[PDB]
Amino acid sequence: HLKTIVKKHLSPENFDPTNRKYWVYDDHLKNFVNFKFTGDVRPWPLSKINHVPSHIERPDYAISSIPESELIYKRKSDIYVNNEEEIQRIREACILGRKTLDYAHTLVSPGVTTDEIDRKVHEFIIKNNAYPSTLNYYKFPKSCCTSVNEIVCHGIPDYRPLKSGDIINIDISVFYKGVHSDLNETYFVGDINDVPKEGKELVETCYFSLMEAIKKCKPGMFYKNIGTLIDAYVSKKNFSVVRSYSGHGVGKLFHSNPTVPHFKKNKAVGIMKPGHVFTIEPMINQGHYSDVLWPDQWTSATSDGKLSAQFEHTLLITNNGVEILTKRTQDSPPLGFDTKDELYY
């Protein structure tokens, strides 16, 4: 009974995203039966969880789903100061995160499913003796997040094929030598001319909002000032800043202090000091700032169904400035606009 329905109605080649009849038989789609979507993106069925070989070191949530070292009590003012040996380890995880993102980028093309991309990303991380940080983190079922068009963040890779003209953020994190790396980029799928013009401007504005904020980071600067910089930059182009998600400390813990909002007049706690490692990851919207959480408990979409774009780096505060651990390299595929690396390195 169950097997036939999956085969006939919930497979990559025959799933109908505009018919909810068989959704009740799929553990992902059943949450959506009464849901009113904000845009054109629909969820598709997921594939079965991908295996992790036994020799790979796992983070503390891999089995139980509960990130216990993150739940250990800390003051909101407690921000971890990495030593040289820890920094080197993070640098190396970030190098691998970059390699993994650059590899995922090469897979993006019309017709390719996000699930295909996730599986190949998973395989690449495993091949490199690392663990995909997202896998089973609060039961997140995949090894990266893929957020197309109006999807703000945490999109779950599924059987939906990419269309020429879509924009897709691919969000990568890897756990390697005891530490995490976190980065992400938004890509144009297929013919750049199929992307809505506002979408090209959106993705590019978001990118520079991020790089311009990073350029100001140094010891003594308030973490709350990041949001001041980002919000001002994107407001000039009449785009808005998502409020529901923030940058975070990263390193020994997947997510730690400080919390880093990307909007102005925020109450972020902390000043930047040498040895601090954290992310800035602004999600910027074409229209209204507001997002709705999907009934899968993970996928966020813009409330108006307009486009959203994100970029993310993992950063290290140095004695006199910042270093961008997840920097692009000569092996990084193009973003479709001049990234003006000369301004930042």
Ranges within 124-153 binding Fe ion (CB under 5 A): none
The nearer residue to Fe ion, 307 or 315, going by C-beta atoms, is: 315
Asked if 296 is part of the footprint of Fe ion (rule: CB under 5 A), the reply reads: no
The β-bridge relationship of strands 151-153 and 240-241 is unpaired
Please count the other Cβ atoms lying within 10 Å of the Cβ belonging to residue 2: 7
**Closest distance to Fe ion from the beta carbon of 312 (Å):** 6
Region from 9-17, 151-159, 279-287, 289-297 binding Fe ion, contact rule CB under 5 A: 279-287
Q: Is 40 annotated as a binding residue?
A: no
Asked if 70 is part of the footprint of Fe ion (rule: CB under 5 A), the reply reads: no
Strands (E), the chain: 131-132, 145-148, 151-153, 167-176, 179-188, 240-241, 247-249, 256-260, 277-280, 283-285, 291-293, 300-302, 308-310, 313-318, 321-324
Q: Which residue is nearest to Fe ion (CB)?
A: 182
Rounded to whole angstroms, the Cα distance separating 81 from 83 reads 7
Task: For residue 185, list its beta bridge partners.
Answer: 170
- Residue type present at position 224: K
Q: Is 171 annotated as a binding residue?
A: yes
Asked if 185 is part of the footprint of Fe ion (rule: CB under 5 A), the reply reads: no
96 three-state secondary structure: helix
The nearer residue to Fe ion, 195 or 317, going by C-beta atoms, is: 317
Q: Is 296 annotated as a binding residue?
A: no
Structure tokens given for 298: 């993970």
**Closest distance to Fe ion from the beta carbon of 137 (Å):** 11
**Closest distance to Fe ion from the beta carbon of 79 (Å):** 16
Asked if 182 is part of the footprint of Fe ion (rule: CB under 5 A), the reply reads: yes
The nearer residue to Fe ion, 45 or 282, going by C-beta atoms, is: 282
- Whether the CB-CB separation of 163 and 189 falls below 8 Å is answered with yes
> Annotated binding site: which residue ranges?
154, 171, 182, 248, 255, 281, 312
Binding site for Fe ion (CB under 5 A): 182, 279
